[PDB]
Structures are given as C-alpha cells and as structure tokens.
Amino acid sequence: NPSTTQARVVVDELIRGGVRDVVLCPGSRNAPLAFALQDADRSGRIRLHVRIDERTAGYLAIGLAIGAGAPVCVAMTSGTAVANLGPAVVEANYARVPLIVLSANRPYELLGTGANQTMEQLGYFGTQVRASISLGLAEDAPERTSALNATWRSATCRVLAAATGARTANAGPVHFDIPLREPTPPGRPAGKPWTYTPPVTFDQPLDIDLSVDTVVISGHGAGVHPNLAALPTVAEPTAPRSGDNPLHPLALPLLRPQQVIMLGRPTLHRPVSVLLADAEVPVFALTTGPRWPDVSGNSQATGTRAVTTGAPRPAWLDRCAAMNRHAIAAVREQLAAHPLTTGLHVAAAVSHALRPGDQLVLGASNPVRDVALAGLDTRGIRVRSNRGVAGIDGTVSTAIGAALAYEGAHERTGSPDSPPRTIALIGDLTFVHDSSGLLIGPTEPIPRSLTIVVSNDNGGGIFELLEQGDPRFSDVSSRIFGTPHDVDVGALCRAYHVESRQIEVDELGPTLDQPGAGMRVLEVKADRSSLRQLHAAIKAAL
C-alpha cells in the first residue's frame, strides 16, 4: 500500500529531524501515521504518549518540546481535537514552541455538508501556524518510488524547518496533513535530514552608549549578550542571565535610569511596564524573530545585538547594587515578620531548595512573579513558563512533558547519575484547571523525578494585589476574583494514584531534598487575605 510506505517515509524523516516524542489521543479514526508511529515506538526510535483529554495532550506536547528544545508532534483525529488543541497551539505560536499538528484528511469523502468526525475547524489555524503543508495522497506507482520518496522527505523537512525556525528564527506550530484513502525507501546516508539546513544568523547591530545610566530588562525569549553582562539586570525567571549583576524588580522604581536595553519579551511587573513606556527614556529592543515587543510604541530602536561604547559609571552600578540589597532585605524581613504563610513564602522556600541542573516550571499568576520577588538566581537552572499568553490552563501536563523530555536527554548522555529533578511551582487554581493531566495510564511514560509544588491559598491570590484587591471592594471581590473552591487536593491526588503530601512551608525544603516517587504533589496551604498587606509592608520597608 502506498499510504503505508508514505507514512513510514514521513515518520523516518521526522525522526532524522529530531522528533523524539509524539502525543496522541483516541478518536473517531486512527491517528495520522498511526502504524508507522507504532512501529517506531516499538523499535525505540521515538516515544509515544497517549491521553484521553485532548486539551491536556496539547500542553503535554508543549512541555515535551520546551524541556529539551526538540520538535514535537501531536496527532489526533476527532471532532473535538481542533477545539481542544486551540489553547496549546496559541501558546506555541506566542512562545515560539516547535509543535507539529498532524492531521489525516480524507479526499474521497464529502466536506461541508455536516459535522466532520475527522476535523471540525475553527478560525485560529489561519492566524496561529507558521505553515500549513499537505502531502499528496499516495499514488500507486512503483515506477516513481524514488521521485515520491524525495517529494515526501522534502516536504517533511519543510514542516520541520518551519516549526523549529531553522531558516526563519521564528519557531512555532505547523499544520502537517497526510491524507489517506479508507479503508522503506531510504533517506540520506548516515541518518541526515533530506534537506539539510545549516546554521543561520540574523544580525541587526545597534549602537548603544553604556556611559548613559543603563538598566537591562530581560524577559521571555531573551538572548545571551556577553557585552551587557556587567549592567544591572532585572531578569524574569525564564530569561537566561548574561552576567552577575541582578537588579531586583522592586528596586527599579527607586532608581532613575536614563536608558533601557530590553531583551526578549517582558511580561512581568508594573514598574517594568511603566519604565518601558516613559517617553523620556530611550528603549532599545534586542530580540530574535520578526516582531519586537512594545506596547506603548515608545521604543527607539530594535535589533538583535548591541555594539557598545563606554561603560557604566561606578556610582551608578554601586547605586543599583544598594537598592538591590534593600529590596532583597525588605522581602526577607517582611516575610520573616509575617505571621501567615503565603505564596511568597512558598516561592522563597522553593528557590532555596533548588540546585544547578534542576528544571523549574512556573505557573502563571503569583508563582512566576513571587519567584522573582524572592530573588531566585537562575544560573545553572532551566526555568520554563508558558509566558506566550500566560494561561493558567495546562500547566500540569507542561511540567510533566518538560520533566519527561528533560530526563530523556539526560538518559541519552549515558551518565550514571540519577535523572535531574524537575520542580514545578503552581497555584491552586492552576492545579485545579489541569488536574486531568495527572491521569497517566500504566502504558505511558511517567516522569522519574518530577515534584509539583502547589501553593494553595484557595483562590486567585494575584487579584488581591490589583485594583480589584483594594479594600473598598472587600465584599464584592471575594466571589468574582477570589473565586474560592475548597478543593481537597489530597483526595484528588489519591483519585489519580499520585503520591501526595501536605506540608508546612519550613518542611518544603527538606521534603524536596529527599527523593520520592517519580511523580508527586507537595501541597502547602497558604493565606491570601493578608497578601495585599504583606506586599504593602515590603514596599514600606523598601
């Protein structure tokens, strides 16, 4: 059958392209490439992950992709797949995650006369994906086997290149259709991809004078810039650090920088937003890819690297370092003097328990910010967070997939050491949102060293710190923003046969130092009724 030959050629090319994991869901029909994928899974060339929940499957693919940087395929055939995959595909587009969405249209059947069990289509594919490629239906022609093998492998390498950003430096989701009718020609020698894409550079140098009082702000997707390593740097948790001179986010409003270098895409902290929008401050955007971040439109120039003249005034560096120490002190002490555990205490504890080579996975809301408020030093750490569109959905499967991909890479190094830990920190709403991600059949890969820390303040803590958190809304905000739920986390973990423990904040460190089952949830109860006061006390101690 030409369709089975074609499917094996594609799967083979996908494996040479660096795909190591494929996610699937049961549906109305067989998945695309199902048998060739099954053969490769059995042979150990790739690893399959199956889930019933199509939404959590999309996010499992994201995690499997950002854990070690590899392209990941997700393949489902059902009438709800496109709708359920939407959230993950949007995150993959905005965070530039190489996600390949496989489909298998049927050209011998009617479309548009009723509900389609294979693909029920929304409007986001047009706007979200880097490419939409459909292989031909496989012709029955042994005469043309060599020419078809070339066409198929060329097209597969185009899918892979579009998703990884190999030539565009703009990785993201790709829609790859392999049609079939209802009801192996080799690749390049020595395992090379059919169409090889050697390394590319996009170079856009900007002239910047460092003698001007400069602060670096690095956000999601920031590059590494050695020539900027000495400047005071307010770094989001997921930004790689270029140097060793951190500036705490809370210190920023008490300095007066005269220019800003912005790396990647900042999304955290109102003081950062305000500074980038200040008309009297030059802002230089250094980022990869086609677009640049600039909500205010205030930025002066954008490129990919800086060509620097001068150096920072010693008085400026020394003044930034003293506000940095005052902010660190203000947090440590007001946390010490607070009589109730909050998410900020939980984040502080997780940050101390971390060691080099760990992978940290951060939920949206307070956790990703609290870790920054606690001054976590991210050097030697891989920090992952779905900052593309900052959803609270799918964070459990993202952590699981990230642990799996990260352990898989460490395994392949052959090293005798135990698999490096993955530690997730997420809020209680975030955990309830994607609890279904906890359900993993015995037939499926399970992380060996994943700890999910759930900081549970029985609602949405971040909203205590916004305008709706003002006391004049006290009666009203509790229901429509606090959103309390009274979930028994321990029961939920028991229901899914997931090792679970409820501990106090000071036991968090010790518990995380002691290894446990491959996958486990550590719940720490927290309070959010006092959170706006705690943050007010930290500000006043600045």
Residues that bind ligand TOG (CB under 6 A): 26-28, 54, 77, 80-81, 84, 116-117, 267, 343, 363-367, 390-393, 427-430, 455, 457, 460-462
In the complex with a copy of itself, which residue's Cβ is closer, 36 or 250? 36
How far is 201 from 11, CA to CA, in rounded Å?
A: 29
In the complex with a copy of itself, which residue's Cβ is closer, 305 or 332? 305
SS3 state of residue 249: helix
Q: List all residues 6 or more positions away from 38 whose beta carbon is below 8 Å from its beta carbon.
A: 48
Task: Say whether residue 295 binds a copy of itself (CB under 8 A).
Answer: yes
Task: Say whether residue 115 binds a copy of itself (CB under 8 A).
Answer: yes
Q: Supply the minimum distance, in Å, between the C-beta of residue 371 and ligand TOG.
A: 11
Task: Say whether residue 168 binds a copy of itself (CB under 8 A).
Answer: yes
Handedness of CA 390, 77, 170, 224 (dihedral sign): positive
Task: Say whether residue 150 binds a copy of itself (CB under 8 A).
Answer: yes
What is the DSSP track for 323-375?
A: HHHHHHHHHHHHHHT-SS--HHHHHHHHHHH--TT-EEEE-TTHHHHHHHHTT
Task: Say whether residue 461 binds Mg ion (CB under 5 A).
Answer: yes
Q: Supply the minimum distance, in Å, between the C-beta of residue 171 and a copy of itself.
A: 12
Task: Say whether residue 113 binds a copy of itself (CB under 8 A).
Answer: yes
Instruction: Pick out residues in 306-365 that bind a copy of itself (CB under 8 A).
Output: none
Residue pair 516/499 in contact by the 8 Å Cβ criterion: yes
Q: Supply the minimum distance, in Å, between the C-beta of residue 539 and a copy of itself.
A: 20
Q: Supply the minimum distance, in Å, between the C-beta of residue 510 and a copy of itself.
A: 27
Q: List all residues 6 or more positions away from 142 whose beta carbon is below 8 Å from its beta carbon.
A: none
Q: How far is CA 75 from the centre of its chain?
A: 20
Instruction: Pick out residues in 458-487 that bind a copy of itself (CB under 8 A).
Output: 460, 463, 466-468, 470-487
How far is 468 from 460, CA to CA, in rounded Å?
A: 12
Among 46, 131, 254, 542, binds a copy of itself (CB under 8 A): 131
Task: Say whether residue 1 binds a copy of itself (CB under 8 A).
Answer: no
**Binding piece for a copy of itself, criterion CB under 8 A, among 237-245, 290-298, 504-512, 527-535:** 290-298
Among 1, 122, 256, 329, binds a copy of itself (CB under 8 A): 122
**Binding piece for a copy of itself, criterion CB under 8 A, among 123-131, 227-235, 251-259, 446-454:** 123-131
- Nearest CA to 76 out of 113, 51, 107, 110 is that of 51
Phi, psi of 246 (to 5 degrees): -70, 145
Distances (CA, A) of 141 to 148, 152, 154, 182: 9, 14, 19, 18
In the complex with ligand TOG, which residue's Cβ is closer, 188 or 270? 270
In the complex with a copy of itself, which residue's Cβ is closer, 107 or 357? 107
How far is 197 from 87, CA to CA, in rounded Å?
A: 30
Residue pair 300/294 in contact by the 8 Å Cβ criterion: no
Q: Supply the minimum distance, in Å, between the C-beta of residue 109 and a copy of itself.
A: 5
Query: How many other C-beta atoms can be found within 10 angstroms of the C-beta atom of residue 352?
Result: 12
Q: Supply the minimum distance, in Å, between the C-beta of residue 210 and a copy of itself.
A: 18
How far is 344 from 347, CA to CA, in rounded Å?
A: 5
Q: From the list a copy of itself, ligand TOG, Mg ion, none, which binds 201 (C-beta under 5 to 8 Å, kind-based)? A: a copy of itself
Helix 343-353 crosses helix 366-373 at what angle (to 10 degrees)?
Answer: 60
Task: Say whether residue 363 binds Mg ion (CB under 5 A).
Answer: no
How far is 541 from 280, CA to CA, in rounded Å?
A: 28
Tokens in use for 67? 């854990």
Q: From the list a copy of itself, Mg ion, ligand TOG, none, which binds 301 (C-beta under 5 to 8 Å, kind-based)? A: a copy of itself
How far is 286 from 233, CA to CA, in rounded Å?
A: 14
In the complex with a copy of itself, which residue's Cβ is closer, 175 or 421? 175
Q: From the list ligand TOG, Mg ion, a copy of itself, none, which binds 367 (C-beta under 5 to 8 Å, kind-based)? A: ligand TOG
Among 370, 393, 457, 523, binds Mg ion (CB under 5 A): 457
**Binding piece for a copy of itself, criterion CB under 8 A, among 191-199, 222-230, 250-258, 326-334:** 191-199
If 0-12 CB within 10 Å is exposed, 13-18 middle and 19+ buried, where does residue 105 land?
Answer: middle
In the complex with Mg ion, which residue's Cβ is closer, 21 or 457? 457
Residue pair 14/157 in contact by the 8 Å Cβ criterion: no
Task: Say whether residue 189 binds a copy of itself (CB under 8 A).
Answer: no
Instruction: Pick out residues in 380-439 that bind Mg ion (CB under 5 A).
Output: 427-428
Among 125, 187, 257, 508, binds a copy of itself (CB under 8 A): 125
In the complex with Mg ion, which residue's Cβ is closer, 246 or 343? 343
Summarize as ranges the residues that interact with Mg ion (CB under 5 A): 427-428, 457, 461
